[PDB]
Write a protein that binds this ligand. Structure first.
Ligand SMILES: Nc1ncnc2c1ncn2[C@@H]1O[C@H](COP(=O)(O)OP(=O)(O)OP(=O)(O)O)[C@@H](O)[C@H]1O
Ligand SMILES: Nc1ncnc2c1ncn2[C@@H]1O[C@H](COP(=O)(O)OP(=O)(O)OP(=O)(O)O)[C@@H](O)[C@H]1O
Ligand SMILES: Nc1ncnc2c1ncn2[C@@H]1O[C@H](COP(=O)(O)OP(=O)(O)OP(=O)(O)O)[C@@H](O)[C@H]1O
Ligand SMILES: Nc1ncnc2c1ncn2[C@@H]1O[C@H](COP(=O)(O)OP(=O)(O)OP(=O)(O)O)[C@@H](O)[C@H]1O
Ligand SMILES: Nc1ncnc2c1ncn2[C@@H]1O[C@H](COP(=O)(O)OP(=O)(O)OP(=O)(O)O)[C@@H](O)[C@H]1O
Ligand SMILES: [Mg+2]
Ligand SMILES: [Mg+2]
Ligand SMILES: [Mg+2]
Ligand SMILES: [Mg+2]
Ligand SMILES: [Mg+2]
Lengths: 260, 141, 51, 110, 354, 351, 278
């Protein structure tokens, strides 16, 4: 009785925000669009255009702001139970691990050592080597040791049936990674979507290239990426696009050669 | 299938009938749910004639029917134009327990087929169906 | 209405407000039957096969 | 993992059938040609779901029979060509040995 | 103010009014019973007002129904779609044929379909031919296909529906095919009318044999348009202009002569045509000294109309760079060479209908 | 009558209470009357327009109607997609043209085509020339394309609509074309405006003829963008910047001299530029006064701007690795080795 | 209440004023196609008892397919003009509607209205709009079109031999059709409308030029004998452009030079074949 149910709607435009009668246009999913006013138990500055809101069923006045919509599949990508593998289970990768840790672990553990010296640590590591060389093993050690949010993304998971859907999941992936103070995204087998662009007359791999183009845009585009430090593993690095294999997207290229 | 009271299921791979097969439609073995419910059943696929999807369906059905199917009396028929185009997997001994040839009807068989379909017509007495059969060398039924 | 008679894939009548199952409607067309109507393979017997 | 390979008719499926007869674990059988789907990403999605059922019914034995049929046979229904098959394989690579922790799933391929 | 009171009082009477459901009459059952269907809604067995004519309520007539009783208030004229309205009321830009160079041969073919048959119908009936109704403007990009359409819309005194094919595509089921029907319904109700469909390859491409669901919806829109251009119901006093720079991808049914009668090739300008376009665009440019237009033409081989305007634009920006209020022939010489360097990034343009 | 007017206005406030049902005006008939389509997908006929003058309404106009009587209570602002509204930058990045090294000609070629017509519109009217329409920045990765776009947004007061190619690729048919024609609609109403389309090859892939399948939906989105750059309605108030790494992929109609008038080639930074780039990204860094950036530029052949910046980033990595508070020339020297990403080799038997 | 069967139908029959002006004589050189349509559409409508006495099962539907411009739609216009039976004209694209269920609904109104107004001919031009063999179950477009096609198959299955309704479907992409539509009892007669032959060409040339003021110097055999594989729409365009040139020169008689120029313009066939291959 006390807590009424709220229908999820998205604010589209605020009319006369300067005045004392600010009117909000909301899009209530598949129901309808309403020009509504704000409720008196929330602040006018708390509602911005393009943000999901909760509205009642009677006058549709906005009652609570809501988190941005994230695909359930994208939400399941963040690691909740850490692996049982530590760095002690990786042998012969001493130089590989230190390079891996000082980009993906050290900045988050001790950020003070980089701000004082005016140092911007690299935000990307590419692990490449033949199969069985420890690429995913090291990433499993990273997730076990890390304290920030870890998101495991397999490249074949980004392949979707419909047009533009794969690029959508990359957008929502980085949108949800930005909702955290520090985040880690792991792109296992990035050769699934990271292949080099080409024109074979027909639309060969055009859709997947767009997903790669979206991933490139989020890593280093017009907007700042955030505190996300990405990490990609592939056994076919020769197939990756030059734009993805560029510093600022994959700053560190750590090679997992066969052990000596 | 009519004479043995076995349910006759034609598997054309049509996406128009997938809503009846099952909302999943990820495997053609989802047909086995509706085949078991109507045992005895005969699953019939005809190759109209990339690789052949009817032949691919045949392999997937034959693999399940090998020893992984509990309910018995589910038989599977394939109709094909030629036997040499068949995959080595289907031509392998033990998969297809009998291969039946359907040669084009000869002079006498054409007379029987002629004798069968001409009953549905108002025929004047004295038609020499034998001569018409001789007038159609190498004709199908 | 007996709960044992409520079989899966059965057509039932539900009340307007409570949606209560109150009647077992006649069963719909079997999905296999519907699949064989659209395929429409001509029925045959041994008498209509020659040679 | 285990793979059974040899000439046709040599008993690869038969030994898997004998394994399924004397196993206390859930037995899941999928022919490799069943991983070729008619839509993009569905093939990778199906390989992902197959090992998800294996996780639920732990301990389990997944028999990927005729695994080579996924690439040695080309079907026009597969919208993506060899490139979609590669993405299907890359999903299979992750499931066999990848980031996610694997429970009591034993994989037999033939 | 007395007038202010009247406006406020008229407001009060307006407030008491209630909206009416828009539907369509399907069949008149009795002298007091009608079958109507809501625009997007179910069908009802409704009544009608006694004051209504009831003879104008033929099947298919748009009507307004009460919200409560669903009884018919009035018959409304055929609804003009907001998108179709924007098509008719689309400003071409007052383009004259004097702003098009080298297309005199192509202009005349265009006007032989859309101008003469609509003004002198008896001339073509006399010979024994039904005049062509559809024309396709094809050629490499920048050759003047849209400019020619704007000139025709600006100059010809006729009803004109201007639309981009990508602007008719709607995600709702059957909406895109509905828009085509409304386009030709408006044209049929406003004869004579001309429908210009720019970038026809957006919806008029070849039908896929193994396409996606999105492709199938577009192909339904295409073959709905095919049924209006040449179908069961003959299209009278409605002409069609279609423009595309990739006619190779179009469906054979779309390119069939019964639908697109004339295939006018707006080709790349030749030596004389380049000279004509250059004078068109360099005309308003401030310049001192002799301007050897032939020198620019000789280095303009392969250019289109857009390059020749860019040559005029870049030559001015060379003058702006040198803080000049005028443009010299030397400024044009760099501009034509600079544009010629940018043409190496452009791929094959020679695409013709099959 | 004043009390009657004021009492009349009170009765309006009760009926003009929120919420309003958002609707679009479909028609304006005479027998003064309107037809509207509500957001609930309902078509209604209004015997009287309502509280809005019928002269101020046009078909397609967004209106807020009464939730019950469906009577037009007010006119509403033009409706733009939230995705289109969310790609208009308001932070206005803090870059500068001095933060770009070795692209002075490229900066000049862009500024005089995007900034000069907006500010000094007189220089074009007096000369009688039309300002350039569309500027494309193409080159190898890391050459500083979107960096200049950020600097363009930094030093411009005009509305900036940052955008990526994959953002215009949408599941539903016509959704991408709606976004493209909404970005230009929003840009026109906020003129002067600049629209930046990074990764143009996502939507600008060349069209092709196929019998079985193809990406016609993206080609439809591109064809819409072709109309917006140069179509039936000449839009001469929105400046368009585009960036791509592979211009050979792009459709020839997109690279037209009316849509993208200037095609700026971003070159690999030369020896002078590379030293300048390394100096640009070492300002906020405690660098010892012995680093020979001239030598580092000689040691970084075939390095783009990103690698030259990564040389500076990796240099502080090694200085922190050895605990130094000042970066030395050796830290830069073997920070070049890290960025070079040469595969491990035992090639000590050479020479 | 129960409504009259002819009521509640968004699709109406052809009125007398909507009858196309196209005659059979207007069509030239389609005797094989004219005969098959007559034997499968208009003759069973009037001779249903003679079919039963002989023993022929009349085809419920007829599929007309072929390259575009080969007389598919026009023959339906001629059939509708020359029929004593009701004609219900529709194109498959109208069945796909925004309101879910309205498509399958308006399919059964077409067949219900045809059944009530027997004898009747149902013509569905551009059947590929609702008869494509591919369906995506996660898209509302393919889910609804699947319902439209399933209802269409159900309606034809629901017609016994007593109901005197004939269905005509036309398509130039019959390769994309669902095989279930071509099963016996639904479309038992597939008539092909190919590109006109040389003998067909001279009949199409003669029938269109008969309405035109030609000069005696015009020899139609010069353009008939050409090896170009052209359709009736092509031949109509050639004659149409021939009068275009006469009109341009303020003439009312088409001479041979107009036909020569019109033929060259309309065909415009790029060689597309190199001589070294033969
Ligand atoms: N350096 C190492 N030290 C110890 N064990 C290792 C090392 N490298 C690999 N292994 C072992 O080998 C297995 C190989 O799996 P891993 O995930 O490391 O492969 P990968 O390099 O990611 O291969 P692929 O390229 O096929 O994905 C690991 O699970 C681990 O048990
Ligand atoms: N070693 C064996 N001992 C007994 N029976 C055998 C043996 N090898 C094969 N068979 C018989 O052969 C039949 C068919 O062989 P099976 O299905 O096992 O083939 P496979 O080795 O999986 O080969 P493939 O799938 O390549 O044709 C089995 O059902 C079994 O009865
Ligand atoms: N013949 C011409 N005379 C004068 N200007 C021309 C001519 N052809 C093209 N132009 C100029 O080219 C520019 C773009 O041409 P237009 O918009 O007509 O392109 P188009 O032929 O439709 O090309 P697209 O294939 O890209 O649609 C205009 O500014 C116009 O002035
Ligand atoms: N010429 C340059 N001067 C200074 N910094 C540069 C230069 N070129 C690149 N950079 C630096 O490179 C980094 C990333 O490059 P940016 O993404 O801006 O380039 P781009 O050519 O647009 O990239 P991409 O082709 O991958 O889209 C930035 O930190 C920027 O400072
Ligand atoms: N035999 C013929 N005699 C005369 N004209 C013909 C003939 N065949 C075709 N035509 C011409 O065909 C044109 C219309 O083509 P029609 O609609 O009949 O073909 P269609 O096969 O239905 O077309 P589409 O497959 O493109 O829908 C008419 O203008 C007519 O002149
Ligand atoms: Mg791995
Ligand atoms: Mg086997
Ligand atoms: Mg144009
Ligand atoms: Mg960039
Ligand atoms: Mg037709």
């Amino acid at each position: 009785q006390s807590e009424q149910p709220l229908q999820v709607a998205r604010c589209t435009k605020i009319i006369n925000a300067d005045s004392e009668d600010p009117k909000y246009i909301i899009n209530v999913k598949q129901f309808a669009k309403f020009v509504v006013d704000l409720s008196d138990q929330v602040a006018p500055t708390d509602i911005e255009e393009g943000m999901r809101v909760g509205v009642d069923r009677n006058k549709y006045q906005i009652h609570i702001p809501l988190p941005p919509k994230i695909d359930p599949t994208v939400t399941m990508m963040q690691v909740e139970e850490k692996p049982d593998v530590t760095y002690s289970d990786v042998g012969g990768c001493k130089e590989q691990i230190e390079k891996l840790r000082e980009v993906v672990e050290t900045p988050l553990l001790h950020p003070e050592r980089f701000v004082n010296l005016g140092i911007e640590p690299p935000k990307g590591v590419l692990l490449f080597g033949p199969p069985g060389t420890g690429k995913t093993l090291c990433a499993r050690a990273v997730a076990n040791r890390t304290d920030a949010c870890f998101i495991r993304v397999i490249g074949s998971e980004l392949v979707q049936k419909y047009v533009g859907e794969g690029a959508r999941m990359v957008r929502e992936l980085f949108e949800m990674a930005r909702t955290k103070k520090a985040c880690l995204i792991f792109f296992d087998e990035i050769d699934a979507i990271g292949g080099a662009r080409f024109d074979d007359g027909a639309g060969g791999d055009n859709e997947v290239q767009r997903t790669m183009l979206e991933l490139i845009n989020q890593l280093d585009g017009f907007d700042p990426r955030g505190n996300i430090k990405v990490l990609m593993a592939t056994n076919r690095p020769d197939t990756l696009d030059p734009a993805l294999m560029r510093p600022g997207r994959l700053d560190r290229k750590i090679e997992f050669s066969l052990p000596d | 299938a009519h004479h043995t009271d076995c349910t006759f299921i034609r598997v054309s791979g049509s996406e128009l009938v997938q809503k009846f097969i099952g909302e999943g439609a990820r495997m053609v073995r989802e047909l086995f749910v509706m085949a078991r419910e109507h045992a005895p059943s005969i699953i019939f696929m005809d190759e109209i004639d990339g690789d052949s999807e009817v032949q691919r369906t045949m392999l997937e059905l034959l693999n399940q029917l090998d020893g992984f199917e509990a309910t018995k009396n589910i038989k599977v028929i394939m109709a094909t134009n030629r036997i040499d185009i068949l995959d080595s997997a289907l031509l392998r001994p033990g998969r297809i327990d009998r291969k039946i040839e359907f040669p084009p009807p000869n002079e006498e068989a054409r007379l029987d087929i002629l004798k069968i379909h001409s009953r549905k017509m108002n025929l004047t007495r004295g038609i020499n169906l034998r001569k018409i059969a001789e007038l159609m060398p190498g004709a199908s039924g | 209405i007996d709960i044992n008679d409520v079989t899966p894939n059965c057509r039932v009548a539900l009340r307007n407000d409570s949606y209560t199952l109150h009647k077992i409607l006649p069963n719909k067309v079997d999905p296999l039957v519907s699949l064989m109507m659209v395929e429409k393979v001509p029925d045959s017997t041994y008498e209509m096969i020659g040679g | 993992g285990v793979i059974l390979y040899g000439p046709p008719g040599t008993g690869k499926t038969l030994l898997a059938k004998a394994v399924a007869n004397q196993t206390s674990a859930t037995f899941l059988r999928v022919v490799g040609s069943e991983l070729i789907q008619k839509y993009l990403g569905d093939g990778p999605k199906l390989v992902r779901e197959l090992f998800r059922v294996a996780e639920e019914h732990a301990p389990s034995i997944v028999f990927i029979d005729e695994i080579d049929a996924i690439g040695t046979k080309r079907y026009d229904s597969n919208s993506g060509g060899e490139r979609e098959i590669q993405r299907t394989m890359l999903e299979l690579l992750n499931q066999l040995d990848g980031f996610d922790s694997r429970g009591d799933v034993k994989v037999i391929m033939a | 103010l007395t007038k202010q009171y009247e406006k406020s009082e008229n407001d009060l009477k307006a407030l008491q009014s209630v909206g009416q459901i828009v539907g369509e009459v399907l069949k008149q059952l009795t002298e007091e019973k009608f079958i109507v269907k809501a625009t997007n809604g179910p069908r009802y067995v409704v009544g009608c007002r006694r004051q209504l004519d009831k003879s104008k309520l033929k099947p298919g007539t748009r009507v307004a129904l009460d919200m409560t009783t669903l009884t018919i208030m009035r018959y409304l004229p055929r609804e003009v779609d907001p998108l179709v309205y924007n098509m008719s009321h689309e400003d071409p830009g007052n383009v004259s044929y004097s702003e098009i160079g080298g297309l005199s041969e192509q202009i005349r073919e265009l006007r032989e379909v859309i101008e003469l048959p609509l003004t002198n119908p008896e001339l073509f009936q006399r010979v024994g031919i039904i005049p062509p109704k559809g024309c396709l403007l094809y050629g490499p990009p920048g050759t003047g296909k849209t400019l020619l359409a704007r000139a025709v819309a600006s100059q010809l005194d006729c009803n004109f529906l201007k639309v981009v094919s990508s602007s008719i595509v709607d995600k709702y089921i059957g909406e895109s095919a509905r828009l085509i029907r409304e386009m030709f319904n408006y044209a049929r109700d406003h004869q004579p009318c001309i429908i210009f469909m720019d970038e026809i390859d957006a919806i008029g491409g070849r039908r896929f044999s193994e396409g996606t669901s999105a492709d199938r919806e577009i192909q339904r829109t295409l073959m709905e348009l095919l049924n209006q251009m040449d179908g069961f119901d003959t299209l009278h006093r409605v002409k069609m202009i279609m423009a595309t720079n990739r006619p190779d991808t179009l469906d054979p049914a779309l390119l069939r002569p019964g639908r697109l009668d004339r295939k006018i090739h707006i080709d790349l300008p030749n030596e004389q045509a380049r000279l004509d376009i250059l004078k068109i665009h360099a005309g308003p440019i401030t310049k001192h000294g002799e301007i050897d237009y032939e020198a620019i033409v000789k280095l303009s081989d392969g250019f289109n109309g857009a390059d020749l305007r860019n040559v005029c634009t870049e030559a001015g920006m060379f003058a702006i760079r040198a803080d000049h209020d005028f443009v010299v022939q030397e400024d044009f010489m760099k501009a034509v060479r600079k544009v010629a360097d940018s043409k190496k990034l452009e791929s094959k343009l020679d695409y013709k209908p099959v | 009558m004043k009390d009657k007017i004021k009492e009349n206005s009170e009765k309006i406030k009760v009926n003009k209470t929120l919420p309003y049902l958002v609707s679009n005006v479909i028609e304006l008939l005479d027998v003064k009357c309107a037809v509207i389509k509500t957001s609930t997908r309902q078509t209604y006929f209004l015997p009287v327009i309502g509280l809005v003058d019928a002269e101020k309404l046009k078909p397609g106009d967004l209106v807020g109607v009464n939730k019950d009587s469906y009577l037009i209570l007010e006119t509403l602002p033009t409706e733009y997609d939230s995705r289109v509204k969310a790609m208009e930058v308001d932070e206005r990045p803090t870059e500068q043209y001095s933060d770009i090294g070795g692209l002075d000609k490229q900066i000049q070629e862009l500024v005089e085509a995007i900034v000069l017509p907006m500010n000094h519109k007189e220089k074009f009217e007096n000369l009688g020339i039309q300002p350039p329409k569309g500027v494309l920045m193409y080159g190898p990765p890391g050459t500083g394309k979107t960096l200049l776009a950020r600097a363009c947004a930094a030093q411009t007061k005009a509305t900036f609509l940052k955008l990526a190619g994959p953002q215009l690729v949408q599941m539903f048919i016509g959704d991408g074309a709606k976004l493209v024609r909404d970005a230009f609609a929003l840009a026109k109403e906020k003129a002067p405006s600049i629209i930046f389309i990074d990764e143009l090859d996502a939507i600008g892939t060349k069209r092709f003829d196929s019998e079985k399948a193809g990406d016609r939906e993206v080609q439809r989105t591109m064809l819409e963008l072709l109309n917006q750059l140069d179509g039936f309605q000449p839009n001469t108030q929105v400046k368009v910047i585009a960036a791509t790494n592979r211009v050979d992929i792009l459709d020839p109609a997109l690279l037209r001299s009316g849509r993208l008038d200037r095609k700026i080639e971003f070159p690999m930074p030369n020896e002078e530029a590379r030293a300048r780039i390394m100096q640009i990204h070492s300002r906020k860094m405690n660098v010892s006064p012995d680093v020979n950036y001239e030598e580092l530029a000689r040691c970084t052949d075939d390095f783009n701007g990103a690698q030259c910046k990564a040389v500076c980033v990796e240099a502080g990595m090694i200085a922190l690795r050895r605990g130094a508070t000042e970066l030395t020339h050796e830290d830069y020297m073997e920070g070049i080795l890290e960025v070079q990403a040469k595969k491990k080799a035992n090639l000590q038997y050479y020479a | 209440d129960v409504l009259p069967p002819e009521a509640d139908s968004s699709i109406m029959m052809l009125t007398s004023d909507q009858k196309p002006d196209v005659m059979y004589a207007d069509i030239g050189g389609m005797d094989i196609q004219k005969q098959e349509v007559r034997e499968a559409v208009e003759l069973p409508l009037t001779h249903f008892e003679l079919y039963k006495q002989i023993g022929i099962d009349p085809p419920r539907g007829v599929l007309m397919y072929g390259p575009p411009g080969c007389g598919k739609t026009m023959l339906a216009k001629a059939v509708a003009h020359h029929t004593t039976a009701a004609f219900i004209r529709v194109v498959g694209s109208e069945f796909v509607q925004k309101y879910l269920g309205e498509g399958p609904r308006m399919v059964r109104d077409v067949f219900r209205l045809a059944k009530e107004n027997a004898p009747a001919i149902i013509f569905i031009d551009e059947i590929d709009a609702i008869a494509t063999k591919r369906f995506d179950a996660q898209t509302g477009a393919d889910r609804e079109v699947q319902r439209i096609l399933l209802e269409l198959l159900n309606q034809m299955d629901g017609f016994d031999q007593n109901v005197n309704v004939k269905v005509i479907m036309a398509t130039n992409r019959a390769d994309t059709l669902d095989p279930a539509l071509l099963r016996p009892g639904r479309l038992d007669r597939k008539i092909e409308f190919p590109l006109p032959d040389r003998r067909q060409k001279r009949l199409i040339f003669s029938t269109i030029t008969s309405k035109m003021n030609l000069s005696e110097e015009v020899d139609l055999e010069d353009y008939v004998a050409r090896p170009d594989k052209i359709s009736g729409a092509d031949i109509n365009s050639i004659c149409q452009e021939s009068g275009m040139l006469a009109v341009r020169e303020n003439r009312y008689i088409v001479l041979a030079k107009d036909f020569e120029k019109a033929y060259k313009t309309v065909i415009k066939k790029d060689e597309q074949e190199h001589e070294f291959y033969k």
